[PDB]
Design a binder for this molecule. Structure first.
Ligand SMILES: [Cl-]
Ligand SMILES: [Cl-]
Ligand SMILES: [Cl-]
Ligand SMILES: [Cl-]
Ligand SMILES: [Cl-]
Ligand SMILES: [Cl-]
Ligand SMILES: [Cl-]
Lengths: 468, 473
């Protein structure tokens, strides 16, 4: 059972929700966690979804060593030292890019498209959101042209929007990072941003980089043009991590614990046979098994919780804290009437559905729930963004736990100034406010509109806020 | 092109085939390889098949951390770490303290976990991709049950999946069996196995294992639960794993002198379309029909690739896809455009078929089935031809020298195995003068009859069970 209130002690509510739903287990190296089936199976769903979509695009998977010759060093084995100290892979570029130079010779070798599903390590932790060790996906492509490369960068970004909005039901905002927030080696970084109302922080959801040609020049990734001319390749890289799970929990969770969007739920309907005195139990258990079969033929994912060592009441709370969307109760009365009682997790509403009507009615409720979760979350995000024009509007907005959309000249130096300044003021009253992205969806920029900070001509509207 | 002959130069053969098929790239750290798609997608398909099957059993996936508090130590970050930390040696050290916390009552049982991941084994000797590597991919399962009976049952269920992984997906025949006391897992009580055979060097190779760990691990980590009557019991555990070795085994089993032969059930591309074009001839007539034929074939779920690359001849493409072991090649030339047919070539036998465009999808599904059945049947016939049923130790060296295994009546005494290993190691060296040790591979589940007085082929003590021996990987 979850006792901490989401809107009162947020970090405590969160720890409760993930721990009490059996998603994680804690561990003696800080920033490292055991990922349990309840969390891992949800990751399987999005992984499957993304994997299928990238295969449609002709992307292939592969696996690279975790060892190369910033860095973390394996220097000893036992007590004997290593004749050469071997590095754990800091980043994949080190290995993939030499290999790309050797595999690419002609335009006939392009585009080259590889992805990896693996875990990675980094070196003040929060489960899912910021960990020393996570699962992710990372893709690296090589093209003959920038247009082709750029088209892939956006296609992936669109898949990341889908992963969040279609699967996780989390609304996200597409945009470019500032010069100071993009990948430093790369030409151009696109991103997806989410928002956590309860502490008003923005959080980067996934990223898709147009890397251009620097790494190609650096690793001599070169190809023969159709006319026989030596050209550099145009590269992209992209990734999305198990952070996405964090955001989903934080977005849809309520006081009773997890709420899982049907489209990614391991168990969509849990069936709970009510036993009170042992005269009707056989018929009841038998019916449930039939309903499971009937529902499964409609692609519904179902688990009968017929464990005899637990009460009906214990089962409700259990499947509620785990966030199963739909609970179906079948007791002696329900059996006699030919019906089942169904309760949605998002709202608590209960329905009495007759056996024949069950598949279509559950299919429909799940769509209702999935959509309802997203729209509620979308409404919240819009409610958390304040359009503003002057810097003095900023601190009052951040105290409302809101983000801000403001006209900015896009001067990198101004962004550092803005970071420092907002940090400084937040202390008097980290607290810093930084660019989250410059949205693809730009409102109009009336002529002569000034940057909200420097007074100079504003170039574009920028999403700002406190951040993870 | 592959230049080494599979039975004359087996190792060289194997090395050419994996590289020229573009299954792997080489890497500056020895025993470490990049696994390119042609290889990795075969891993993807077996993983899918296996992961579907264990979910039906209630096994659930999880992810345990790669680092911990014979070990490889990470000591610095840049130029510098306070506690020297370690790449996870086995998974038991992290997993079993967690099982100890998770298990308290009979209601918590059974507990069935699995992990898909990469592993580092630091000691490898001489490196060969899929066979002897620093890093590999695997799955490892770990369960815990109220009774030994239930766990044992799970062990055998898992072993059955391992037979299916090999025989159904990779068309590799295997033999289920019990390991001997000296070949089993040290700490466990019973260990079952799935063995394969490599005709070209006469070696057996362990394909996968499923262990009845019993309770000694429970005792060591204090994984106890309370009985349904309040008594503290130790859990009965299992574990089981299957690695990328499965692929090296598939490679060895079906390959021939032109290169790889990949079973249609796991081939990344099942049907390569090869437009009979030359440089700057393209008029769209050939590519056009090729694309239509592709679309038509994917409507029957055939995995299809057109090789439209402009700067290679058809002959070079024929060889390139043969080396890669694509099961089926479909050739579309001007002549075929004129006759309303395609010519398709079976990779496994060379046999060619003239097939009319409308017959292609049903005739190709049928061919792929046949290729899949044939690969298994021919490997199974080879497997049973490689096994000699014997009565005494004398018949041993001659059989080893025919690159075969032996099936012998054995008393199962653990010291005899160590002896049988030494003697054969010694006799092999004698011949080298003018490696070689023979061990138990398994005690097969499938027991032929055992007449009343039958003696142990080596000690003369009365024999207990028939036992499969051979030289080994
Ligand atoms: Cl938090
Ligand atoms: Cl899935
Ligand atoms: Cl990346
Ligand atoms: Cl924070
Ligand atoms: Cl070999
Ligand atoms: Cl194991
Ligand atoms: Cl088939």
């Amino acid at each position: 059972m979850v006792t901490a209130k989401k809107d009162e002690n947020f970090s405590e509510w969160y720890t409760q929700a993930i721990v009490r739903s059996e998603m994680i287990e804690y561990y003696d190296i800080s920033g490292c966690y055991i990922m349990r089936p309840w969390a891992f199976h949800i990751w399987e769903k999005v992984q499957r979804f993304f994997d299928d979509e990238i295969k449609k695009m002709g992307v292939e998977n592969s696996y690279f060593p975790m060892f190369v010759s910033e860095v973390a060093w394996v220097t000893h084995y036992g007590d004997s030292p290593l004749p050469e100290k071997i590095a754990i892979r800091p980043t994949s570029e080190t290995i993939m890019y030499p290999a790309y130079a050797k595999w690419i010779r002609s335009h006939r070798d392009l585009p080259l498209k590889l992805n990896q599903w693996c875990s990675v390590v980094r070196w003040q932790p929060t489960p899912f959101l910021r960990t020393r060790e996570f699962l992710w996906q990372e893709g690296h492509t090589a093209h003959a042209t920038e247009e082709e490369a750029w088209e892939l960068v956006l296609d992936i970004l669109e898949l990341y929007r889908r992963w969040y909005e279609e699967c996780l039901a989390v609304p996200v905002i597409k945009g470019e990072k500032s010069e100071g927030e993009k990948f430093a080696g790369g030409k151009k970084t696109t991103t997806v941003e989410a928002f956590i109302p309860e502490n008003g922080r923005g959080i980067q959801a996934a990223t898709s980089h147009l890397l251009g040609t620097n790494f190609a020049k650096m690793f001599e990734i070169e190809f023969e043009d159709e006319e026989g001319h030596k050209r550099l390749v145009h590269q992209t890289s992209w990734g999305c991590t198990t952070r996405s799970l964090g955001v989903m929990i934080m977005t849809h969770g309520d006081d009773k614990g997890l709420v899982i969007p049907p489209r990614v739920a391991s168990v969509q309907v849990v069936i709970i046979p009510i036993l009170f005195k042992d005269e009707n139990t056989g018929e009841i258990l038998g019916k449930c098994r039939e309903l499971k079969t009937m529902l499964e033929k409609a692609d519904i994912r179902v688990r009968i919780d017929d464990r005899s060592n637990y009460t009906p009441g214990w089962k409700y709370n259990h499947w509620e804290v785990k966030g199963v969307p739909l609970r179906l109760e079948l007791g002696p009365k329900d059996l006699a009437k030919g019906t089942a009682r169904v309760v949605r997790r998002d709202t608590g509403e209960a329905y009495q559905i007759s056996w024949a009507d069950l598949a279509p009615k559950l299919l429909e409720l799940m769509e209702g729930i999935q959509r309802s979760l997203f729209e509620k979350a979308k409404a919240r995000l819009h409610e958390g963004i304040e359009k503003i024009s002057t810097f003095d509007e900023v601190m009052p907005a951040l105290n409302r736990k809101h983000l801000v959309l403001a006209p900015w000249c896009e001067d990198p130096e101004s962004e550092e100034q803005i970071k420092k300044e907002t940090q400084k003021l937040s202390e008097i009253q980290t607290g810093a406010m930084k660019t989250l992205c410059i949205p693809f969806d730009q409102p109009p920029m009336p002529e002569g509109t000034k940057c909200f900070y420097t007074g100079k001509p504003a170039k574009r509207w920028t999403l700002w806020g406190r951040s993870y």
